[PDB]
Amino acid sequence: SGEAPNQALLRILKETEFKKIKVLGSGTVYKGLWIPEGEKVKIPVAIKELATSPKANKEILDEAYVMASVDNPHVCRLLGICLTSTVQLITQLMPFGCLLDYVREHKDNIGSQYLLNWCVQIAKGMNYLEDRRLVHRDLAARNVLVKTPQHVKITDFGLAKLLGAEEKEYHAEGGKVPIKWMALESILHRIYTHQSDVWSYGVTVWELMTFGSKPYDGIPASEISSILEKGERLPQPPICTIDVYMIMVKCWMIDADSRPKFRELIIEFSKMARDPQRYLVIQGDERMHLPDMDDVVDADEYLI
Template sequence: ADVCSEDQIRKLMTEAVMMTDLSHPHIMKLLGVAIEPDMGLPMLIMPFMAHKDLQSYLRGARMPDDENQPYSVDQKQKIVFAFQIARGMDYLHNQHYLHRDLASRNCLLDHQLRVYIADFGLIKDVYSQNHYQTEPGTKLPIRWMALEALCDRMFTKKSDVWSYGIVLWEIFSLGQIPYQTLDNEGILPYLNSGNRLSVPEACPPAIAELMQQCWDASPMKRPSFKRIVDVLDSLATVELSYVALEDTV
């Protein structure tokens, strides 16, 4: 492996130190760090995730492998995925962290299909302030970013909420690519014109409404993750013949 730079090592170790401060059933736990001299970037050691990432799992449910046991993701399971991610993000925000790269590809699944939010490479401690602005040239997840983040590279808790709305859309579209008919340069004009992603087929009305709230042009009008957790809990209980969400936290 190529020898990594001091800056790469510093960034990874910063992520490792940050992860040791986090403890929640839906946040990835750090088990250790493996370092071999002259062997490239150190490795973060984390629990084994039997079902890999949520994006791959959703796409597998859309096109099951005929050689293996086919599986599907029903409405109840989608709600559980959404609920667990919202719980993890609510905890992260309560610890004064922004994620800034929330997407289904960064949510991992264990053998019980429990979700763990991971990939904290863009995470930022905002304990002393309510927002964070990136440096020019930083690579960013354009299709998951809020309007204000696209315009000004300004990230807040409410820009994480926008990204969560995209994750909801991913869950209920079974892992489709957001704005798949647009290139990256076309997304901001599309959103500035008042357009948003179309609601996936068979998406419950309450989820569709929640997505639209997450994508409000005004960050202050977007719900908090605590509010999102409450909405999903009520939806599972009232509209979907009770899902035992308390068993997932």
């Protein structure tokens, strides 16, 4: 067989097993409890539905197809779907919300250990997504969720595409795409590879280091294609040593094969996470609380 059978289980859940408790966003996302029938368990969940359009349920279901196929500590789990009036997605609740809003809100308690670790964790999820031959196509700080301050997960696969065991790209079409996080080949030829995920990783790391800044704040999207062609990129963030900023910049090579692989980002940021203060200069760094062997890396961070 050309490709491997996807034997993920799609679980369908009874309407009465939830206890939807509150809106988190407005489709519309909710907080709730899931009590599996019989089992002595209560599981905190987010429930995401959408009125019903025949075109809307087709897209949320692709999202479920993907979320149901991924299984990694740094990627979000689908717990199931509920097939009522309108289709609901069910995931593990990530109590602290998306990471973008979180760095903004907690700016003054976020120290370099957390920043660099988040970076390691996002790279691990993304490297896993790559192993499963899946191109996220929408990586950004808004699409990273926080389980605890110690633990983030990649989310929002409403654009993920699977590549064959021999297809080395994706050719997309019409539809809204966030262009500021987009590799260049993706703005010119609508090309998307694992390596164009790496670009957006670049921009995502830049969001964290600048504690939640909008990229090219001001610059309208129609020009972005041109600015990037004239050799211009995002500025070095204040807290950033050239060592860190240099990795960001490498993620933005125009030649996508010269950009780093997610498994290299994991190794680079690991080493830096071992002396956080030598790499990020954060004022008041040492005393912060949220709720030679330069080259040593742990095997758990060495994934080839």
